[PDB]
Amino acid sequence: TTLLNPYFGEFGGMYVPQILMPALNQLEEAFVSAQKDPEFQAQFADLLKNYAGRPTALTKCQNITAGTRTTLYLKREDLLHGGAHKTNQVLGQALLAKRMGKSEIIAETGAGQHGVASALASALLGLKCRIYMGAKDVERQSPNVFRMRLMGAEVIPVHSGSATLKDACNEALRDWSGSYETAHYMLGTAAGPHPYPTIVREFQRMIGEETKAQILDKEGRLPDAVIACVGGGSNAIGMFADFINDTSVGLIGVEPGGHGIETGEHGAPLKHGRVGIYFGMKAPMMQTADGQIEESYSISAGLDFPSVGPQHAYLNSIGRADYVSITDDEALEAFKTLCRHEGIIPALESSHALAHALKMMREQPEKEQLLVVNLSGRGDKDIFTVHDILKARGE
Amino acid sequence: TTLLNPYFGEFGGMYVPQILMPALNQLEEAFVSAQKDPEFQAQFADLLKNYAGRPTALTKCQNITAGTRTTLYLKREDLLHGGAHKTNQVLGQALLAKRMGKSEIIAETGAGQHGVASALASALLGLKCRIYMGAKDVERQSPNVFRMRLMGAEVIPVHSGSATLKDACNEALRDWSGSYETAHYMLGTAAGPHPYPTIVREFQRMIGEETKAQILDKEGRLPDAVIACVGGGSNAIGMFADFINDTSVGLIGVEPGGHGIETGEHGAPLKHGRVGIYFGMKAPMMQTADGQIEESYSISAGLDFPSVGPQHAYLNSIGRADYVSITDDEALEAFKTLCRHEGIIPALESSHALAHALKMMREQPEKEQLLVVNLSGRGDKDIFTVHDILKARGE
Amino acid sequence: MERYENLFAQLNDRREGAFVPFVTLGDPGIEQSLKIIDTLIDAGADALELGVPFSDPLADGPTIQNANLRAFAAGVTPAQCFEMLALIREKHPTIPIGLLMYANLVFNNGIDAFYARCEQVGVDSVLVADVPVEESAPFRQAALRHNIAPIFICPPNADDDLLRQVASYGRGYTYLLSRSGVTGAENRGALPLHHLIEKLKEYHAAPALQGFGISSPEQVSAAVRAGAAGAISGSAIVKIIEKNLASPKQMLAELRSFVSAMKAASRA
Amino acid sequence: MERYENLFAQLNDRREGAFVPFVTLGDPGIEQSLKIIDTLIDAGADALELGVPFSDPLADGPTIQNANLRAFAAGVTPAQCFEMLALIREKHPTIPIGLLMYANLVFNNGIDAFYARCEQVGVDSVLVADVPVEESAPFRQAALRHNIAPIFICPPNADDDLLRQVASYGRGYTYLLSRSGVTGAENRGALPLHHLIEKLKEYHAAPALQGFGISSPEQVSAAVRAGAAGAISGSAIVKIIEKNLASPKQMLAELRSFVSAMKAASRA
Numbered sequence A, B: 001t002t003l004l005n006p007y008f009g010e011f012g013g014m015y016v017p018q019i020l021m022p023a024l025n026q027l028e029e030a031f032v033s034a035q036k037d038p039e040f041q042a043q044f045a046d047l048l049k050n051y052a053g054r055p056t057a058l059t060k061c062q063n064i065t066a067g068t069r070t071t072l073y074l075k076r077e078d079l080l081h082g083g084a085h086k087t088n089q090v091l092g093q094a095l096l097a098k099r100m101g102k103s104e105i106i107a108e109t110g111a112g113q114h115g116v117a118s119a120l121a122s123a124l125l126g127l128k129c130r131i132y133m134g135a136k137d138v139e140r141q142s143p144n145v146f147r148m149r150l151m152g153a154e155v156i157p158v159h160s161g162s163a164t165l166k167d168a169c170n171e172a173l174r175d176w177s178g179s180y181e182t183a184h185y186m187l188g189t190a191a192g193p194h195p196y197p198t199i200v201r202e203f204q205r206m207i208g209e210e211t212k213a214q215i216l217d218k219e220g221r222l223p224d225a226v227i228a229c230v231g232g233g234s235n236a237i238g239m240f241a242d243f244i245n246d247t248s249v250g251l252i253g254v255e256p257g258g259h260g261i262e263t264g265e266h267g268a269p270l271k272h273g274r275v276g277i278y279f280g281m282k283a284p285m286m287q288t289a290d291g292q293i294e295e296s297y298s299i300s301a302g303l304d305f306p307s308v309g310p311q312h313a314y315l316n317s318i319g320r321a322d323y324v325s326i327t328d329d330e331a332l333e334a335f336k337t338l339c340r341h342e343g344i345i346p347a348l349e350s351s352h353a354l355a356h357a358l359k360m361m362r363e364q365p366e367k368e369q370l371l372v373v374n375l376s377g378r379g380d381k382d383i384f385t386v387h388d389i390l391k392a393r394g395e
Numbered sequence C, D: 001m002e003r004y005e006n007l008f009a010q011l012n013d014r015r016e017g018a019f020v021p022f023v024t025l026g027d028p029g030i031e032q033s034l035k036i037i038d039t040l041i042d043a044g045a046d047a048l049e050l051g052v053p054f055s056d057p058l059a060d061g062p063t064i065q066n067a068n069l070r071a072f073a074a075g076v077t078p079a080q081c082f083e084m085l086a087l088i089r090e091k092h093p094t095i096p097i098g099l100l101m102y103a104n105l106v107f108n109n110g111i112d113a114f115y116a117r118c119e120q121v122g123v124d125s126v127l128v129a130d131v132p133v134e135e136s137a138p139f140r141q142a143a144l145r146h147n148i149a150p151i152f153i154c155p156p157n158a159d160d161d162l163l164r165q166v167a168s169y170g171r172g173y174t175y176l177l178s179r180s181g182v183t184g185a186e187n188r189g190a191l192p193l194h195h196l197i198e199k200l201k202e203y204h205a206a207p208a209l210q211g212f213g214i215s216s217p218e219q220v221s222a223a224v225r226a227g228a229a230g231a232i233s234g235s236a237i238v239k240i241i242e243k244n245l246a247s248p249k250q251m252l253a254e255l256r257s258f259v260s261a262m263k264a265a266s267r268a
Ligand SMILES: O=P(O)(O)OCCNS(=O)(=O)c1ccc(OC(F)(F)F)cc1
Pocket: A017, A018, A019, C022, C049, C050, C059, C060, C064, C100, C127, C128, C129, C130, C153, C175, C177, C182, C183, C184, C185, C211, C212, C213, C214, C215, C232, C233, C234, C235, C236
């Protein structure tokens, strides 16, 4: 039994070992209680405003849309304390951990932004934080490893599997199944077992709420579409949620196409995988014919995951949201373009979203469209990665 | 002749080669004109809000003041787009450059934050940007070198002298004296020849204005003191300006003490130098008995300068502001403390300000005091520097 | 599921607990795995728990993680596992065989088809590690339709509702979890909580086998003394495989000695 | 300032322009610098412009930057510069000597005291590079009180107010800047703007010397043809010092040839 629906159509559920079901039910119960607690909401709101810096700006691009009929705004989650949207829901989950009397935090991280958010919240709120990070990501997102450790978090390199995000997820969950009595698993995306996809959406939905109020103020109308990258689903569902019942507003999610979908080296299960059960949920995944989970690939550590959150699988199934893919090279071009023409250095994850919006504009330059891209993170963590690539390519 | 007073008591002036005086007068004239232009102010305000993310948060420390009678707030300029307060006045000066019909920007940088701000503003507003940076700083602040170049700025290493900030200043000024017809010198601090100390204050004074409104809202009263580091003077005068006529509000500026004032390896001319003429101004400087300008030292590139802006020299002379120093080791301890107990990674520059506030608290823990520290920047640029130090010290 | 009923009836008649080793199918190779399993049986295993190699075994610690990896290195697939199971059943007609599955391997191309394949090769039970009773309906229904026992877990902090569900839904044997965490010999689980054992009996649950961290004969004896019908050991068995990869003969001799000692302890 | 008046009166009588080399005092060492300056004079320098080594010479390009550095490497101080100036004046009683100063060296321990020291050793003019006319009052007042000519700059885009101020405030000679930028031989300045030359004469300014980027006899001739009273060359002279650091004798011979050629060009 649960208080809330663990499913979105066919997708979702609580596919965890039996040992973890009480922890999940306890978390669901604490969440439902906190959502109707005015004191919790005031604490959460105060942290978001005075500590994390909400509301974030909505920036109109001045240059990259020149000569077209596209108006493009960027929702500036890159300006959030920590440097990405991850910080939003971490503040809420940290408060839930305290509410449940836990003093320890487990977290997975890929881009290191959820790890940094987990570490900063744990430092602030007096929790002992340990973070699993794939060994490949420890290298390609190294600035965030330094930030996490300076804030007193234990960072544990994961060498098994692809040594990337899915492998960190695996270890975090194995850890929790033995430490749940004292540790809260601060899952970093809108995926995994219920109640996480629901909690993470509700603790990220200020992104879309603010965006709506800001676009109404500046343009007097709703966007034609909002566009966000999809690694697990949290920044996209945070942007989407408040627009779902606004039927005229397109919801576009962007999966990583890696080296090209045709190469098999990508992270786009929603459009190119098939339904499976893994990481506590029934969801689209990259898997072999036999049902082994495949290793994903993206230039961006934050998108490099072979599955996706169940609410996105559902929104896609009913046609409410559309999902597309963007390759490494397309994301890199969007990265460069934003740096050089708007003076913003975006996360490579966010650059996938931007890349698709630039494609929407370039493909149909006389189409009148008002677009918002969720700029989920800043790109400081990526500058060394991008620099090395551009150098090995002349430039 | 000038439109505005180039002096603060004895300090300031326009000690530049005769060739540059028309450029300075032109800039002063454009500034006076822009300040009464409602269209300029609306453009500037729009950039500050929707592009840079103003107003910045005022954060109450929850943990580092425990067990004392100190209440400490942090003015969160670390949350500004770019990662430091530098971005504020760069947006205003960039608009002035456009207003004067210039298409090129020259800037010095030490910490690389003014360089990054100059580069991002130039990318946004369509200017060609070249940045001088001491070769020592290119290394110890390397993340900002990557950020500047990704945004399309030319970064020019300066190997002469101490290969730090003063040497970058020298080269920028030499450049401008030959290129002023097409290039605007976007000086990054409240120092140098008139009108820069005045312009930079006026384009940074939103820091103190916001701080006042925020502290009144949260505490119902003015701070007992506001505390800021002083490299050239801009973040401190930006915090101070709106409080200068509030006679009960202490203004405390923190100079870098480097390895210790007694070692001669510091950057504290206000309290330990003597009046001289250099970099276009009459101001306190570190100089030899003969009047050669000395090389300064600080662990922080942003504070490593052998002089200081004239308005601070003046405020000190009349006793309106007090100035103190903080050593490398004190700044490092404040850095660590903020990371681990508030989940904020501060610039090492800003850590000098924090260190002094922590000293005010620790020295007199039962003294009732309401303090604001200007957290002028985030510390991403410093994490490699700090990490290497902590490792070579066990830790 | 009948092979378990006959086993426990026989064991009860002899005043004996069951000893049930776990190994990964195809670890370290198909032929050696088949020989390993023959040695487990000849040494006195009352039943088998057999893992199908899975890419992401989230209920398993490093030892059995690495068993899965060795099997994959040998190119072992679920189809080859079913080939092995046919061979094992052909040699050993009465021993109960349980599979340890992860959900995706069962769900992959049809739950019903999976349990049909199990019935065809003569498997007796299936434990799906990452399907709690709350998500179990299509799995236990398909299992029962194909005369397969679905195995469910009774954790140390199981409440009464869970005990009643596990007793009603499960067949063959009830898995009595020794402790939280993942599989691992080094992490020793506690004694069988007597209240759970007696409550399961009160609710007419399938007989309880204790598992996780059981790696010594002393623990097997304690499990049977506490009232459990037997004990399962995995990582302790797999560590012997891992230790002797270079010595196939020494591997089997050490497996035989260990299993013999563990089984003897179940007679206590 | 009288030594300049006598010089320009003599040059006017001979229908000649002035050639005035710049060098840094104490570059590359005190004794070699003294010999260098003797060679400049013997080769026909009409006057001297002499730099006191300063830590941060912001009106100077790399060539003269490096001259300052060499002097400092030899441990040259302003006190030693004044020792040199005494020696130079002792040998050469009539040649006008101008100092090229940066403000802090003059301001350091008293402006008045600095110009007093200048008068004592027999310096004739002081040009403070980073003091515009707008900031000049205490410097030109102290200069005039000690019979020192304060030298001011007329830039290419000087307006009428500036021309009148420079004409009124300055003595000895008026510095006619060839171009914007910093000192440098490679960056050739333009012809003397004739309107500035004639305007300075109209306002009874001290005679104009053109400087910055003057590095060839052709440029010296063009300066005098355009109406200037002479020309200053620094970096071109200093480059000969830099080029021949290892050959003191070749240095002086090359300096002599160069200066002779530059001076001859001023007779045109
Ligand atoms: O001796 P150990 O510590 O290696 O444990 C051996 C257990 N092997 S097994 O097939 O019974 C087994 C049983 C249940 C498992 O997960 C679940 F409880 F979540 F269902 C995993 C493995």
